[model samples]
Target: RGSHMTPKDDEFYQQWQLKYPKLILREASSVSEELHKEVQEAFLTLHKHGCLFRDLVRIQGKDLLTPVSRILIGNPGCTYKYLNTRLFTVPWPVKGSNTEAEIAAACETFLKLNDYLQIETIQALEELAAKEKADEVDIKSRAAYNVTLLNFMDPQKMPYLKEEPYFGMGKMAVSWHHDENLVDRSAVAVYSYSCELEGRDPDIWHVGFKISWDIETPGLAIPLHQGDCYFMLDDLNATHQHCVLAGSQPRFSSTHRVAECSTGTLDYILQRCQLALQNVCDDVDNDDVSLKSFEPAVLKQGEEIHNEVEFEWLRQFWFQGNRYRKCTDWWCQPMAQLEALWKKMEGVTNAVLHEVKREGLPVEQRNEILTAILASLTARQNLRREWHARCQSRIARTLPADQKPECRPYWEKDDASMPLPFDLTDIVSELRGQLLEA
Candidate 1:
């Protein structure tokens, strides 16, 4: 409940906090503790809807973990577009899934929760925007544009989490980086909820803002305690990068933002799915290559093409790269429009699924065999010789030798000698609704 949760001599404070007093809207989580339970319901709802897997970013045709486990629900194809384009998240309400009544209720929960939870802060942003009148900072479509929730847990406790080589899976929660998916001058209203047992090691965690990208300069931390919340106003994210650092226990954060995706860009990506659809050759009268024949080239290419669409779909929304910031408003688009676009994309995907199945790739229930194969391949390559080597180099760059976290070599199944890793059904579409999120 003070300026920062650190002492004066703290290096992070000296280096970053002193330099940027204005980054946070307030120095602490100003929401009353009395109201924490109400806010905690949002966290509870998210908790109930679990499946917090590490966010996967495709780099060189491989799905690699980003620094944290995240979920975003909003405008179709909303995602931080700058990372390697191929990205995936577990769906909400799930397609297999829930009913319209439940779905409608589920969808409104985002907006209603935002309305209730961030009521105070959004007003503050509105007041600030009104005062600034810079025009660029206007927050429109405030009803809930994009909702992103992050899970910061002790991955060491989970077998799958401990096995991966992502940057700060255990100690730091997330690595250093600026948020890239947001559009407009809209602020990212983040609420932190602590979920560890009553008296477990005082879950010490904070949201850090880096004054500079240079590794040696320690960044400042904002004490994020139980029920604490804060705001990133104006161009703070664009101006300075931030990261979540600390806590070996579990914590959850919710950020509601106005994400960008111009209708023009949306149309273009929809068309790309159509174009990629055409690339999948239609099955003919016993002409030539069967599913196995098509497997290597077609499946690989589907992964490649879908990866490209996944990348472009979100990437095109807000960021093209360093100089390129692609953005627009898609909050107004109806859910039906999003579903129609999705159906079109799904139609194309089904064509490939049918083609693959026609060749005798067994369908687990409904064509999940491709995903099984893809999943096995991903596990093999994720921590294999190459990725492990990449981690070593990343570790070297992050800290001096003595202070660096020791990342040992890994090969879970005896030095990668495991036979070629391939299993599962379905040609694609496992990535369908999930990748569309930001």
Candidate 2:
């Protein structure tokens, strides 16, 4: 029976040992053992989660065996979290081995896993791509069918595009980008909208979120109306309001609606895309009140504004270049002819989905796609790197002698803080409630 009584007054070391033997044992274990146990558990979890690792190990046991199998003999609980952490959070080729043999052994283990899993990973990815394509087809077909079924069309009565071969499609494209730490958002492929509110100006506004796993989605179709602002909520603190302009240089607010369309379809699409992006950020509730507005930029004097032109530039800068561009205006445009835009956006998204499906079929398909993408990205990255270097050199050359003075003895970095207008506790509580309801 377990002891129910306190330690005897005469006892010291024995009492200590009795009270914390497990803790002592844990502390005494080597780092490698602890880490190995954790890694093993993680692999086991991955196997459970439908990853190809387990199947590959079974099929290629003799052909490719490694020490990784041994690592899976430890704790199995929380393996998913452990594996995710290892994949995303830590540096690879773990760093604490003292002897050359230990390091070599670790490297060999990693190499074997890499080699064995290569083909299987491709298979898994291809399966995911096929699944995504099927999903896209279902969604798009249903959405179109619904429009015809309900007679629910764009409300603004906007005119159709006059161009041949693309008669109904608009010029703008919209899509989303994924990031592990930040909220996934869709943006205009071609800047065609702007946000400029009038009368009751948004001191803070929420920009509508674009939602997609792929970057080619055309984005949500906002209806054309006067003083209509798009609200985007990515996280607890960030949001944005947007609008678009059609005419130029007059510097006055402009407004218009579609010549042939209605607002119903536009409204529906807007809600759908906004919800989609929110889901990517783990914002599952449609009525989450903790969602806040974005801070409006204070425009400097003499700043000219146009939403259409500004949005185009913003698309190029944000999606293609991975840079943020400042907008001078704050007003938004109503969804005019949104269906036309939606059709075009849908086409681009489907194209990307098709490509993903085609290239995910087998090991060769994946390798070919990955290699091409890598090569293109590498070239672009190099060009950008060289351009940044030139810009920095130019800035350095222009530094004034008096302003520069002497080199600082200590390192100095710039830090800026934004003041909160509302209490964060209240926001958090509201978010929790929304999460529970969801």
Candidate 3:
């Protein structure tokens, strides 16, 4: 019921289908009524913990509300950023907690289904990687599931077709988009069920399309009911996009992914901790008269950066140090300096890119300029690490050592160790070689 496709478009769609078929498994696993009840209870338990749902548009001056409420759970440091909103990883509820028991049982059931599909997919990818002589990092990036998103969709909050040719009823729907935060070619498992409301079915309709850029073209749709689970293989994430159409009933889904370990995960945890510290610092400054009086003019620097820039890079770089900018104390001096260095580094990187592109600079000069920029970047990174260590040490010594759930950082324990970021030296070298050839 959309736009017409030309012969060329038809050929592309046919090819995509042939290359990447959809994998759907109805009743993928035996989800007992008790398990379903427990899972639903778990959702409520976590929601009551507070701070689960967030406004859709968190950026200042935007007012778009999301139709669904979501919470992220994983080993400490697992987070996802989308639409300028960062979903920081919340530590799983303690093992003895009812919330933890329910989710743990559900995760076990999910893993049973997930492991089989993941193993088969990984084997296939491994063979391809061997044939292509892929890097170690590339293969490791596609490894096991550690993070999950719990999404709750309440029927009452969703939009309804109140008056129209298609006016019977409506359900909340998530827009079409590929999961881009994970490593390329990752597998994602989405298990959904009806929640709360009884005597009615809240079926989720899954629509798959080859490309999100052309929504007018027809795609595939499948109805997903209670206990329904589906695996989206690596190829699907790269070549296609999917969305859920709301049904008449309230819905709950746990979407799981085995995120890449190393640098990406480490950066996520560090960034999250920095934000948390910033919040704490702000609270401290607001509470103390002496500290409040010492607030600097540049205290608003972080807010200015957030309001004036929409660039993801700038936001990440500046917002992390924003709270420290509020105080002119000795402890905050390093952070303020680090922020200045980041700003300078941003400017230097931009100039180098411009000189290379617009001026057509020679290789040697370009390399020299890039080397200097990299050095500056490295220095800033070193400083960031030092500042983070200081914050961690301070928190450890001043904060009580009691095993309070709220006091622990997400990645504090053995089970929640942070993964390292991806190593890009080989990839960068390969790219540089290609650039030189050109």
Candidate 4:
């Protein structure tokens, strides 16, 4: 129900089609059964992470599941937006060691695949550039291009993942939406799907295309299979929308794109955390209250950010006892590291409790100190919640691809680019399911 206003410019669409031709799929990989098995094993490890690898979103104040469980790898701490949330990638493992053996392997395997795809993408871009009669081309991409997203759909685990066991082919792969999260000149994205379920069915799934404006007309479809690599290139995302057609084969895909978040986002969170620590100190110094006077609290705010699996992963993985976390060369000579700061925060909080146990302060002061300290701790908690709200403001929060003029069809609308519109709760249960739920 929250679809944005449609665009009206046939001429613009025509020009767009010229600049970005209909993509012709390519075969990326056909000779690596070993890598295929490795990919499958890696996905199995990620899948066993207990739904922590998946995304949880809220629509109309109700919890919703993503079409597939995804885990990000490559460039530790890199994150991208999806469904109005910033998805975080996992850090590389240290040496052959990590929080756990399987988790370490999973993270490493994906990173390697990301490198592999990066090379393939580079080669493809160069070839395309050659046809343009330009020996001068900057094929090297920015660091943001290092982001590798793994989408694994397991029929048994994914709630609505259908295999069409009884008759028809895959009815839907995923919903239609432009890859607006990526950088403008991404140009091409390379993906390889590998499925190694014991009993494989001879089925066909496809990568489908359609002009975003002419949603009624299907343009083309490419049969996507295990070990088959493909490319979706150029202004395609600017002129056309694409989707996947499934044939019931359980699948996992690694799509590489140039997606990034500004360092300002990091600055925002890091500065707030520092302020939180400062607030805790201030609480210990200036307080005029009694712990006995404390009334248990209740707040009407606490939901979205708490559900972020990334935060949970970091919390559980780091706090649940990591014995060999520092053995690897994960950013050697690192400075004021995020991990160090987090560990300090943890110690800082615990230090308060241990300090309270020292009995050096009068009973009255103890209550005042603890109360203020907790109130201070909440400063950091609330900061994370605000980040969640910030994410909601990113288009595609309420419904897939609802960002005004950002999705391909409206790629260049509002010539003047007026003030931004506040994100509204635009949920269309059925339409979104058909268009985005895939």
Candidate 5:
């Protein structure tokens, strides 16, 4: 169990929330400095690993999926053969033309900030690990915590340092301690239900620890024999299976042995193992339902950034953008809606064009076209407010309505803010006068 320290005052949380803006601004300034120094290192690390997408734009004329998949796999050179073999693996339909180029452009944006982002992330992690260490009483426990969280736990038990899934590859391993003796009912669920659920027949089955969770309230530890009632939906099955314990200590076992390692070493391994497991788990599952429960949950259940400054700084990066994102749902329909509004305006333009072509361009035709065009312009102009409302509506679905961005009144300026209809009217009036004189 970890230390449970309460705040001295209730106002501390409120004050901390308010103080975040200033704190985040300060941290961003510091990260800017760190980015300058460490981005080169990160870029080089990525390049050395062959994850850089330097030639993505140049390969636009070639097979689109090949280049797109290379960009996705990160280590393009490494995954080139793998991608080539799995040409039919992509789930969605691939488009013809330079869609690959567009995707490549977006991927390169990640390259621009990937180095800085990684360095910032690591700096934040190191600082937090240090602070957590400072808060510890027993050096052994502190050492263990650091070892597990920072380094892979029990290197002999785990994979080698630079193997496929290691530190630097966005993996994390952490340990959880319980105050009371406990048994894992979930593990029983996995072992007993594995064959029934997965339909994979094997001589013997093994389980792995996915995440460590402290029991909210202790209950009867279900025996590992009965695997009933542990099933989840297809979407949630993997993480649930992962959460099961790999093995358990049985009371009936006649012989017993204990393994010992330094606390620091153990801590490092535990943290690293936790991360590695999570990373490996991510490889199988993409839609994590557990993460969706947080207040601003899009980025939650992601790699945890423990540094308070860095954590707050992340909030800053997403504050406005999150509003925009929330305004549009999973598909971002407002963009289409905006397009529709413009198309309607185009319809009005066509109406004027038809009027000009027929009727020999008389004053009556000019007036009629102007009137029709004005009506269309008015409809299009009204949609700006509708667009704002739509954005606000989408935003309100996720967060509180009061907290949503307010719809400000649209104001008109002297010359700059004149409507398209007004401009068209002036042109039509001049043309009409010329036509009448001729």
Candidate 6:
């Protein structure tokens, strides 16, 4: 059966051959020149806003900014993590100002693009399933372009390592990885806009595949030029990974996905955001772990440091400290306030539920009210368990034996038996039984 051993695999490749041979690529300039201009202008305006580029992390203990800068837009609090760096979605630029208008327009255009590609993906999958005489393929309902991760890659910003092969491509270029965030979805739309206005082209290579980490597997590889759009179908996310090769010029790509609106997804994102923010705060608090702390010994001696080197070091030190201070001052104070607000909301909800029960409200109405509130609390509880598990795993991976004993697993503690903020299991079970009876 070659690579198509299962009935599903046979059907998948069969339809894949008929409908989408390699992958769906559309020439954006031909699709709508006006839209292309709008998107390009949007990218330029957003870049002008500044702060799009932030310190990612150190590689080999060297403080290296990301060669590719990015901004997350759409659904608030939505988070994605790559290379242990967390990116949280901020609100899309509003339309009140001129620059804001341009950014908003770009977002709208991509949302429309996402919707069109999702429909195509669904149709392709359904056709494949039907032709193979297999069970109907289940595709989740996705919202219309609720999130977009816009990446700006500039070769000039990449670190140059003369001694390394591929010019340190491991740190500069995006490594192969599946779109784990969009795995449950039918498809994701990736639109590449070239920033090569003059001189040399980026010559960026876009590669997609049918299997993870296996370069020999049959897949599609193309040179993405200015104003190119591609649809990464469901099969690709499930079975493959994709990456972009480092190039000489600058390029921008916006990968759009429909946001999952379920309470569970939102809760998970919230916890991730909190953990990431906590990590940032912790890093800022620990000055010993900073780039300045790891500065070369030659540079540490004032006389030995070159004039330009000393100036550069001072600028970086000031910038890092200033950013950390500003972030803490802006976010840390409000974090406590937000916690208080949540507690207040919980108290108010409990009070209302108690009053409703005391008044002997109708069973249906009482159950409805309880169900609405309990779902969110239950989701939050689930998130806590997940966060604990993640923390335990991280500790085991990174901590020593002596530290390991101090960092006990969350479930092993006495607090593990503490009652949930609210219990929905019994109520939900009774409700389900009632529905079955009906």
**Best candidate per TM-score, number?**
4
Q: For every model shown, what is its TM-score relative to the native structure?
A: 0.50, 0.15, 0.49, 0.54, 0.18, 0.50
Predicted structure 3: lDDT: 0.45
Spell out the clash pairs found in candidate 6. Answer: none
Off by over 4 Å in 6: 1-22, 54-65, 83-85, 93-144, 159-172, 197-202, 208-210, 216-220, 259-337, 341-438
Better of 3 and 5 by lDDT: 3
Query: After TM-score superposition, what is the CA distance of residue 260 in candidate 4 from its true location, in Å?
Result: 1.8
lDDT (C-alpha, whole model) for all candidates: 0.46, 0.23, 0.45, 0.48, 0.25, 0.46
What TM-score would candidate 6 get against the native? 0.50
**lDDT of model 3 at position 307:** 21
Query: 1-438 in candidate 1: lDDT tens per residue?
Result: 112224343454554445654355443346555446545664555456442444434456454555565555443443434454322211233234321333334444545545654565556666765655763224444424455554546544532432112222124566556766567555677767766521112247667665444434444556677766677776677767777765655677767666555422445556655554454344652222223333444454544444444323332221211111111123324223433333333333445445544655444422343542354334333423343344345433454332232222122434343221212122223443322434
Locate the minimum summed-lDDT window of 10 residues in model 3: 401-410
Q: When superposed on Cα atoms, how far off is each prediction in RMSD? A: 15.1, 33.1, 16.3, 16.5, 27.3, 18.7
The backbone clash count of each candidate, in order, is 15, 55, 7, 3, 24, 0
Q: What's the C-alpha lDDT at position 316 in model 1?
A: 26
Give the backbone clash total of model 2.
55
Put down candidate 3 lDDT per residue, 103-209, tens digits, no spaces. 44444444453454455446656665565564545544564666777787665666542211111112326656676577667777776766523111335344334
Better of 5 and 6 by TM-score: 6
Between candidates 4 and 5, name the one with more favorable lDDT. Answer: 4
- Model 2, position 376, has a per-residue lDDT of 29
Which candidate number maximizes lDDT?
4
Which segments of candidate 3 are over 4 A away from where they belong?
1-22, 26-38, 48-51, 58-63, 93-143, 160-172, 196-210, 215-217, 260-263, 266-438
TM value for model 5: 0.18
